[PDB]
Amino acid sequence: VKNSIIWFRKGLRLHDNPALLEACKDAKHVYPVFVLDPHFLQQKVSVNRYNFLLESLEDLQRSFQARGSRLLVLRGKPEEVFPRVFREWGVTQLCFEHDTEPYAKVRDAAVRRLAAEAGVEVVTPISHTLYDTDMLVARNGGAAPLTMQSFTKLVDRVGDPPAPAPDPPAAMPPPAEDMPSAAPAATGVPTWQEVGFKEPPLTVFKGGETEALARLEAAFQDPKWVAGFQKPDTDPSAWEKPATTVLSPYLKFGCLSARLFHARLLEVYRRHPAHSQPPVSLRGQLLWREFFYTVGSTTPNFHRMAGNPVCKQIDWDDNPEFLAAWREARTGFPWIDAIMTQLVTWGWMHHLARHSVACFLTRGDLYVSWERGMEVFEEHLIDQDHYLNAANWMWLSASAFFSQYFRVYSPVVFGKKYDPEGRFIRKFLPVLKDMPAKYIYEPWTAPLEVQRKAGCVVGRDYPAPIVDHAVASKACIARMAAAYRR
């Protein structure tokens, strides 16, 4: 008979899952498996992103239980667990969503050689991305595009991406009964305390497909806001209602399908003729995700500077003091320190908010390597995507794609043009709650009498600015011009 396995790595969803529909077709027993390493903390990861994964895993378990099935969370490594369950469950087909990451290509190639020895058919459909990224490189001549202007004109030449896959049946083939490896006491979704964490998460974004589909409809409640979306015109100092969709964590883990997001955008665009065009449009932002995935998958060492052909070699300085003050939110600038606080509390910031802290650390003030800043974002960001985190940090550090190093974000004026009262700063930095708005961006300029009255003395309660921007920026700007001369 047909007994299949639907492997969950990304694509933690039931909607638009071509790998799940194949594993349920003509099947007698389907096995939904998520391979979890219980020693992942003995090898860098925050409790916000990992608990976001667990909350997303409980969404699958509730969806499988409501359809007569059950999610299996197997412990160990995939190279050591799958050969055991291939013979124990009598598997003839293995389906999992395709992945284009470096570790995934080596991991999957190991699983492919194991299923061949066992006689298991491997089906790997694409659904994490809009298009087949390898197809885009072939149509473009064998090389991937390096500019958004050339990439946007390539996806328009191919046309619309494949429509989202249909929903799975309301009743799925359950796993076989009385299986030792499918025992609930060893295949249950663990909590954040049981995986080896001590402090609870503080984020306000709950993971899961049900939460992803709810935030999608909320974003589409106002179709005029969707059609007239322009990314550079959004408010980075908005936290009560974030001025963007905040769908990056659900798209990263796979709780939300990009194909369904793109299909919902065209329904609004077809009825709104004057809708925004890429790259500033909402569809353009998805094309940014497609563009970086196409370039990074074909470029070696895309997450590094050495051995990376698309990244310019820059003599980044080794300054642990500036790196520690930046990652611990004690640089003296309330606009920068509040964003880093929002990073360790929520795990998500506005794109322009990430622009200020990335510019301040790299080509702007501290001249610290973008890799050291990417590793800090890799820990706390609940939307940690290998290819976006890299191409965007190379963007803000003038290492790739971007080449206008004279544009330096002022860590004082940028936040003040959106929020002069400093509501964003008073929320994440409560030590400056009573500071007047006149000095809330430059607390060192406030008189001592104002510092005493507001309850925040610069040097005792809030640290002094580590650098003078006018002195640090001109130094970094001149060094970038000397680098580009090479």
Ligand SMILES: Cc1cc2nc3c(=O)[nH]c(=O)nc-3n(C[C@H](O)[C@H](O)[C@H](O)COP(=O)(O)OP(=O)(O)OC[C@H]3O[C@@H](n4cnc5c(N)ncnc54)[C@H](O)[C@@H]3O)c2cc1C
């Ligand atoms: C230094 C730096 C690091 C970043 N690291 C990440 C990361 O690890 N993961 C991540 O998802 N994005 C990353 N980004 C991109 C961007 O900041 C986020 O995608 C955005 O803030 C998420 O908000 P949203 O979901 O409301 O986006 P929206 O504006 O609503 O866009 C919708 C979707 O489009 C995609 N998208 C939007 N902006 C970009 C972009 N600039 N590049 C690629 N795809 C984009 C995302 O999938 C996003 O969910 C980074 C940007 C910078 C400057």
Ligand SMILES: [Cl-]
């Ligand atoms: Cl500015």
